[PDB]
Design a binder for this molecule. Sequence first.
Ligand SMILES: [Zn+2]
Ligand SMILES: [Zn+2]
Length: 60
Amino acid sequence: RSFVCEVCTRAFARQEHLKRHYRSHTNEKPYPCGLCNRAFTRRDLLIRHAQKIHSGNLGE
Ligand SMILES: [Zn+2]
Ligand SMILES: [Zn+2]
């Protein structure tokens, strides 16, 4: 069929192309804020981000 990335469901036509593109889909910021569309490296950071700007109440 086609080489589609298993992270953003994109499309390709080569294995080496999607290969190097997959390397940037695992060591990326695993804490994407779902309020401002940002990214963090630590989990404690994402909490201090919303609780200080968005909000808290268990969530965000
Ligand atoms: Zn991708
Ligand atoms: Zn945010």
